[PDB]
Structure 1
Amino acid sequence: ARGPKKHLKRVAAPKHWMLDKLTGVFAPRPSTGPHKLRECLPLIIFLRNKLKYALTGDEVKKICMQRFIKIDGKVRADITYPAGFMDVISIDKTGENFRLIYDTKGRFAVHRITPEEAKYKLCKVRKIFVGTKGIPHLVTHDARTIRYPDPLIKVNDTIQIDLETGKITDFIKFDTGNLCMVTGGANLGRIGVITNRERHPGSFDVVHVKDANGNSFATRLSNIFVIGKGNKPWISLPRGKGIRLTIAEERDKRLAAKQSSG
């Protein structure tokens, strides 16, 4: 390497894209954007592989160059634009709106939302900051810089922003007894209520989360997103509601629905 790399081989592509082997050598290396390369869903992948609207990368090119698809209330004419967590994908001509939040397993589900819910999103604040005139500053998980915020919002809270104005409406404080979706590690997509936070000065602080059915699991603080106050999520969830039942239970449910079909 003598500079930045531009090709991403299909075997090196993040596993949650569920890309087949015998299609090609390469996968779409996501163009730089708000979310990380590893943890996004490129617009070509979501449009062609998941929705099956297009068949080839040229067909996706033909769609995205007619200004149809709108990511977070702005038109994105880049077929490998990184669409990541909490992002709101509205297609106007079809009349359909998707919020990219995780399946109960470590992948992105294709969760349809209503016109009135596809008008805002939840942003995890990353670092608070003072500018060049004692003007306070936020930085969120999706690279948004919000200045003149509410003077109580701190480094691990969640803010609800509007996708026209880009201004803070209401916020959920990071407390014990607040709903959190886990957005990294083994427990990727698990929804549960924060039970404890265990402080380790110099190391990564681990946070205990309780599922609805009394399933207790820990995650590092970085891989947690407060998505609701109490047991009330301020968004709509996929079918499953983030439980991640065992493989024996998933089998039982599968062949239950199978034998019921007959």
Structure 2
Amino acid sequence: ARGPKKHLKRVAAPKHWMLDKLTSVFAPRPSTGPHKLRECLPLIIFLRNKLKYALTGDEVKKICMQRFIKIDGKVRADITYPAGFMDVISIDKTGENFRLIYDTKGRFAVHRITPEEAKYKLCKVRKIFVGTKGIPHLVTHDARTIRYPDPLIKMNDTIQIDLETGKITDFIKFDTGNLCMVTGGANLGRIGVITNRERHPGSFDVVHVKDANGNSFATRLSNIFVIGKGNKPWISLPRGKGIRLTIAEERDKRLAAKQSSG
């Protein structure tokens, strides 16, 4: 190509959207935004595919242009806006509020929350730099550039920010023992306490994470978030609590629920 791509083929789309392979040739190419192409859930896919308010994409136009969908605090009239991790989708006329947190299976769950909870989100810091006149700047995973943060906030921390203002409240240091939502790789959606960050100078730093049931796994650092101090999370978790019960456990727990419920 001799310039940037504007289309995205349906078969080329990221797997976690769970678009089929018979409705169209194309998937919605996410609008350029805070989150990456492969990590974002576009608004259209959150409206017509998950919540199923709309049927078509012209329906999602007729909902979003009425200025109802308020993604993390601000109204969005773009059907392919990249809503991503921790972002709070406020549909005001239904009085519903959703936080995009990963189900323990790779896909984003529909996780309803209290409006009292919806007022804040939690942001992983990507880097810190010192701006034009000794002014410490602070770039997050959703690119929310914050000037004059608390000086004890380091590179891989998280920051509980208030959406109505956009100011930090409290920050979780990246320390051993803290809860961790894993936001990349095979362990996507998994929750557990951070056990051992193993430093590999020049290469990628792996980070071991012990689960709540004790089923310890590992991840590359870059794919790791922190959601709580020790064992207590700062969000509401989606059901399953980021454990990833095995295919055998899933099977007999489907059999058990299928017979017991009736």
Indicate whether the TM-score tops 0.5. yes
Report the secondary structure of 1:255's partner residue. helix
Report the secondary structure of 1:37's partner residue. coil
2:6 maps to: 6
Output the CA distance in 2 between the equivalents of 1:253 and 1:206. Answer: 33
| 1:251 to partner: Cα distance | 0.3
| 1:259 to partner: Cα distance | 1.4
Report the secondary structure of 2:126's partner residue. strand
Output the CA distance in 1 between the equivalents of 2:62 and 2:135. Answer: 44
Output the CA distance in 2 between the equivalents of 1:103 and 1:41. Answer: 13
Report the secondary structure of 2:115's partner residue. coil
Output the CA distance in 1 between the equivalents of 2:151 and 2:61. Answer: 44
Output the CA distance in 2 between the equivalents of 1:75 and 1:249. Answer: 41
| 1:260 to partner: Cα distance | 1.5
Output the CA distance in 2 between the equivalents of 1:239 and 1:261. Answer: 18
The structure 1 segments of at least 4 consecutive aligned residues displaced by more than 4 Å after TM superposition are: none
1:34 maps to: 34
Deviations for 1:126-185, whole angstroms, at most 9, x for unmatched residues? 110101110101000001110001010000101000101101100000000000000000
Output the CA distance in 2 between the equivalents of 1:69 and 1:259. Answer: 39
1:131 maps to: 131
2:145 maps to: 145
Alignment of 1:217-236 (within 5 A): 217-236=217-236
Percent of matched pairs sharing the same residue: 99
| 1:80 to partner: Cα distance | 0.2
Output the CA distance in 1 between the equivalents of 2:257 and 2:234. Answer: 31
Output the CA distance in 2 between the equivalents of 1:3 and 1:144. Answer: 28
Q: TM-score with structure 2 length normalisation? A: 0.99
Deviations for 1:52-107, whole angstroms, at most 9, x for unmatched residues? 00000000000001001100110100000000000000011110000000001101
Deviations for 1:184-219, whole angstroms, at most 9, x for unmatched residues? 000000000000010110000000000011111010
Output the CA distance in 1 between the equivalents of 2:140 and 2:179. Answer: 19
Output the CA distance in 1 between the equivalents of 2:222 and 2:212. Answer: 22
Residue ranges of structure 1 left out of the alignment (5+ in a row): none
Report the secondary structure of 2:181's partner residue. strand
Report the secondary structure of 1:226's partner residue. coil
Q: TM-score with structure 1 length normalisation? A: 0.99
Q: How many residues were matched structurally?
A: 262
Report the secondary structure of 2:227's partner residue. strand
Deviations for 1:15-73, whole angstroms, at most 9, x for unmatched residues? 00111111010000001000001110010000000000000000000000100110011
Across the aligned residues of Structure 1 and Structure 2, the Cα RMSD in angstroms comes to 0.6
| 1:261 to partner: Cα distance | 3.1
1:166 maps to: 166
Output the CA distance in 2 between the equivalents of 1:140 and 1:210. Answer: 25
Report the secondary structure of 2:90's partner residue. strand
Output the CA distance in 2 between the equivalents of 1:3 and 1:184. Answer: 29
Output the CA distance in 2 between the equivalents of 1:261 and 1:246. Answer: 21
1:255 maps to: 255
Output the CA distance in 1 between the equivalents of 2:87 and 2:20. Answer: 25
Output the CA distance in 2 between the equivalents of 1:212 and 1:74. Answer: 35
